[PDB]
């Protein structure tokens, strides 16, 4: 019987999505051609931010166990994927984060104490400062992708030379909204950057159980847009991919999908939950290779690292104090932010709760 070349098909499509890498685990440059143009100060700032973010995760976990934080999704291990991608953005760019993408929106301008109030569950945590282009973290997986296509189209219609960037995880890619978002952006040639952070696990679910797709980058093919699979533990690879995607978008050529290969060293969240598979990825730590890369260039030192750590600890201490001091929510606060003009039922209930709060 006649045989279609399906094995070849699978293999040939795979060949189009090889893992992009600039820096190996020893901090050696293995792709000089693709090295992004960054000043010495930029490279240092990149490291500072990743170190800072690692400390933020350690403190957030401790503060959660103390009851001083609420909902928290650990980020340790994803600093290249989260901080180096953000580092490629401009202030005019719009971020649509998932629930784990708190570090990106902090670096983009959300005050740390508001991030803590988001965790705790306080409307003030979500009152984004004006002109800071972010949404609060999205709980509905994939919803941020279809919203991102609309933000990107909005930017395009206004002639802005900016992108919408959005983040989800490997589990995220199985959602209808994941596919609809990339396809809509593709269809409108919209300046969107879609980032898939593949940390191997959707809660307890291995990525192998999401899909038989051999990469997640290749899902771009279904929208007819370019995809890139990147070493997600490599700050320079991540940066270079998002930078390239941004350039393509802002010049009218449409979106890109980027899959980062990373890991989260911690639990899914702090709500509910191999030792050797955790140890394997511990050696690939983005901090390790970037430390080596900078130290070989005379751009980093124990003293600078220790300084950033203490700076992070002090800023976290003050942010949590500032969260403690924000006034408690009243039902009349929640009613007042429901509409511009209160409908009759909410008018009545406002008076009831005003009187109760008196």
């Amino acid at each position: 019987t006649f045989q279609f070349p399906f094995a070849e098909q699978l293999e040939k499509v795979a060949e189009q999505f090889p893992t992009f890498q600039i820096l190996n685990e020893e901090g050696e440059v293995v792709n000089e051609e693709a090295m992004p143009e960054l000043s010495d100060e930029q490279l240092k700032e990149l490291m500072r931010r990743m170190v800072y973010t690692r400390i933020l995760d350690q403190r957030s976990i401790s503060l959660n166990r103390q009851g001083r934080l609420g909902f928290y999704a650990p980020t340790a291990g994803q600093e290249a994927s989260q901080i180096a991608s953000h580092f490629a953005l401009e202030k005019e760019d719009f971020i649509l984060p998932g629930y784990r993408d708190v570090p990106q929106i902090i670096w983009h301008g959300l005050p740390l104490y508001q991030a803590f109030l988001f965790s705790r569950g306080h409307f003030h945590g979500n009152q984004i400062p004006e002109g800071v282009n972010v949404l609060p973290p999205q709980i509905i997986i994939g919803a941020q992708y279809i919203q991102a296509a609309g933000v990107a189209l909005g930017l395009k219609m206004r002639g802005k030379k900016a992108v919408a960037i959005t983040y989800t995880g490997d589990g995220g890619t199985s959602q209808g909204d994941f596919y609809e978002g990339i396809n809509f952006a593709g269809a409108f040639k919209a300046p969107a950057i879609f980032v898939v952070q593949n940390n191997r696990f959707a809660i307890s679910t291995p990525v192998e159980k999401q899909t038989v797709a051999k990469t997640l980058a290749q899902k771009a093919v279904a929208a007819g847009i370019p995809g890139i699979q990147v070493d997600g533990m490599d700050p320079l690879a991540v940066y270079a991919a998002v930078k390239a995607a941004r350039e393509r978008a802002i010049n009218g050529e449409g979106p890109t999908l980027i899959e980062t290969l990373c890991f989260r060293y911690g639990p899914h969240t702090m709500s509910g939950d191999s030792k050797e598979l955790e140890n394997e990825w511990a050696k690939k730590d983005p901090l390790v290779r970037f430390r080596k890369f900078l130290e070989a260039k005379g751009l980093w030192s124990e003293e600078e690292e220790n300084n950033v750590i203490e700076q992070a600890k002090e800023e976290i201490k003050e942010a949590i104090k500032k969260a403690d001091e924000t006034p408690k929510q009243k039902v009349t606060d929640l009613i007042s932010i429901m509409f511009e003009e209160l409908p009759f039922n909410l008018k009545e209930q406002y008076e009831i709760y005003k009187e109760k709060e008196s």
Binding site: F94, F123, H124, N126, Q127, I128, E130, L135, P136, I140, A143, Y145, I146, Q147, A148, A149, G150, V151, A152, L153, G154, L155, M157, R158, A164, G176, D177, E180, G181, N183, F184, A187, L334, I337, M338, F339, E340, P343, F344, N345, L346
Partner: protein, 324 residues
């Protein structure tokens, strides 16, 4: 001019496109084609594809696109081709856009109007005619508007678009062009959340919306010959309810019925009944009864005539209340 309801809707859209450069209309086949029911006919030709455009076939994506566009300062007026397809876009509506003002503590908002046809009597295929207003009525942060006349539709649609929070605007397929009514040219608004008296009466209050307002007015004409004076209240908006107008009427008559096309377990009739019993039970001569469809899935098309409530059911239930 003497307009059909669909003409009145088009006129509202044209006026808002003209007076607000941020207004965008989009959805399946609304562009070149001018809509499967011609509600957006000529709009793309007059105002351009940057402003009136077709989308890929995906309701969820249409919802997301509207949310995104709103975050970028636009005034989206997306279309969902039939409201039975609302199940594909329930998260964008109820999980997202209804909640964004609240979620961001007023930092962002959703000046979105979702237009969708619904309603029976025209023998559509499955999930085209379903009355699902009862679902979005339960979501805080939305307003839900359902006109019964060309005059109401144009004035409420303009109000809806100008409203800075999400409004679901539901267009009854049976009423699109089955009659004409005088409609003022130019812009006018009708308050959202405000009912109106379609027929003044003394003996019983008949509360209705959508195609059921006509069935109620028909019933009230026949009830008059029987010596029963019915006040017919068109809700116009089903969320939020115009409590003052409803209670005002019920306090005068001391008797009321609520009439909906939706199944008894769906629609918004139970909410109206609960509000009346709460605020005006010291005026009630009798229970507030409901006229509603049987609690089955929307009827196979040939069974619409025996399943849909009609003026005869309104008469029967009215007289039930009169004789209680």
């Amino acid at each position: 001019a003497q307009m059909t309801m669909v003409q009145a809707i088009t006129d509202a859209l044209r006026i808002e496109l003209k007076n607000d450069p941020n207004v965008l209309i989009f959805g399946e086949d609304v562009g070149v084609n001018g809509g499967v029911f011609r509600a957006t006919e000529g709009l793309q030709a007059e105002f351009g594809e940057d402003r009136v455009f077709d989308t890929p076939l995906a309701e969820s994506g249409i919802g997301g696109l509207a949310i995104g566009l709103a975050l970028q300062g636009f005034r989206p007026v997306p279309e969902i081709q039939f409201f039975g397809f609302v199940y594909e876009v329930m998260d964008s509506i109820c999980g997202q856009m209804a909640r964004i003002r609240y979620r961001t503590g007023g930092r962002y908002h959703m000046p979105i109007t979702i237009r969708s046809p619904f309603g029976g009597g025209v023998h559509t295929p499955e999930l085209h005619s379903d009355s699902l207003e009862g679902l979005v009525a339960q979501q805080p942060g939305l307003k839900v508007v359902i006109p019964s006349t060309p005059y109401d539709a144009k004035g409420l649609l303009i109000s809806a678009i100008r409203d800075n929070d999400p409004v679901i605007f539901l267009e009854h397929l049976k009423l699109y062009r089955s009659f004409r009514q005088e409609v003022p040219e130019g812009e006018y608004t009708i308050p959202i959340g405000k009912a109106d008296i379609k027929r003044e009466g003394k003996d019983i209050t008949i509360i209705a919306y959508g195609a059921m307002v006509h069935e109620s007015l028909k019933a009230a004409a026949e009830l008059e010959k029987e010596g029963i004076s019915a006040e017919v209240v068109d809700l116009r908006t089903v969320q939020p309810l115009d409590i003052e107008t409803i209670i005002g009427s019920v306090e005068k008559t001391g008797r009321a019925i609520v009439v909906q096309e939706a199944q008894r377990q769906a629609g918004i009739a139970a909410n109206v009944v609960a509000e009346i019993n709460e605020r005006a039970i010291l005026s009630l001569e009798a229970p507030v009864l409901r006229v509603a469809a049987p609690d089955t899935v929307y009827p196979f098309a040939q069974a619409e005539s025996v399943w849909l409530p009609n003026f005869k059911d309104v008469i029967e239930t009215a007289k039930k209340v009169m004789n209680f």
